[PDB]
Amino acid sequence: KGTDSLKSSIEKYLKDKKAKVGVAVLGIEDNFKLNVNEKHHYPMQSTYKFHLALAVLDKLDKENISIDKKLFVKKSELLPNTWSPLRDKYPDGNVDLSISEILKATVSRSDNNGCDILFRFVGGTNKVHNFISKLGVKNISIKATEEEMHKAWNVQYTNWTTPDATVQLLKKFYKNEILSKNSYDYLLNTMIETTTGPKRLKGLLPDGTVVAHKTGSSDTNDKGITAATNDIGIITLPNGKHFAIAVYVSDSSEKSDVNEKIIAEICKSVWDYLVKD
Ligand SMILES: O=C(O)[C@H]1/C(=C/CO)O[C@@H]2CC(=O)N21
Ligand SMILES: O=C(O)[C@H]1/C(=C\CO)O[C@@H]2CC(=O)N21
Ligand SMILES: O=C(O)c1nc(CCO)oc1CCO
Ligand SMILES: *C(=O)/C=C/NCC(O)CC=O
Ligand SMILES: [Cl-]
Ligand SMILES: [Cl-]
Ligand code: NA
Secondary structure: OOHHHHHHHHHHHHOOOOOEEEEEEEEOOOOOEEEEOOOOOEEOHHHHHHHHHHHHHHHHHHHOOOOOOEEEEOHHHOOOOOOOHHHHHOOOOOEEEEHHHHHHHHHHOOOHHHHHHHHHHHOOHHHHHHHHHHOOOOOEEOOOOHHHHOOOHHHHHHOEEOHHHHHHHHHHHHOOOOOOHHHHHHHHHHHHOOOOOOOOOOOOOOOOOOEEEEEEEOOEOOOOOEEEEEEEEEEEOOOOOEEEEEEEEEEEOOOHHHHHHHHHHHHHHHHHHHHOO
């Protein structure tokens, strides 16, 4: 037992769930670790917008470009029929939008068009892949823009991660090992000031728990398979410490609300273990 009855407890919970669920927990201040179903590749869906914002913010820090500089977005780039509050605000495109505003839409509101704008800005999906790899985090594949993921069903499975790689990226980011102080502060606040995934990592946590996170979601095909239901981020414990956590519910046959409950229950049991010192 110890941190092992916790792993065995999560495995027991996953036994009857028709899905492949990956889990990873990394203490921030204290060196706590937990893995469930780790040697597997889970599609990231919109969670990889976190990695993109990192590459964006790093490019700004390094080239000394202000997050306030404006980018001209062509109307042809605000694609329709994809989630994009940017397009809904500026339906005619051909507009100068600050990188700050585009980041906000991409991270806090999961803007697909904002995401693809920001991929163009850093030089494409492969540039983001290199940036992550050069940080010393392995087993993250970043190959498809949001536009490419909305084509064939298979294409989302080519943006994949291990759960371990995510918590490693989260904790590097949180301990301010990646970005300038101003860039760190900005991305953190956009990950706190989100309304997404209310029933995921946050669902069963006490009221007022600080949760900086990024969700991702996919469709359900006609054999009832939801490819990806995800939530990842950093959580504050009652004693003021933090832990990074990622839950990837992949290729689920379960109903949608069950898929989020899986994230919520798993995170809740981790929350209870760590709340006991
Ligand atoms: O001491 C604590 O507060 C928690 C914790 C939090 C993660 O930094 O990590 C260690 C493992 C555990 O229960 N401790
Ligand atoms: O098709 C596109 O790429 C662009 C463009 C100019 C081409 O550089 O003009 C229109 C506005 C828009 O979205 N289109
Ligand atoms: O727009 C959102 O709030 C959002 N959230 C997710 C992850 C699943 O909750 O994806 C999106 C964009 C469309 O999928
Ligand atoms: C952000 O999580 C992505 C949302 N939509 C992606 C798709 O619709 C692709 C699923 O087939
Ligand atoms: Cl273009
Ligand atoms: Cl409460
Ligand atoms: Na999302």
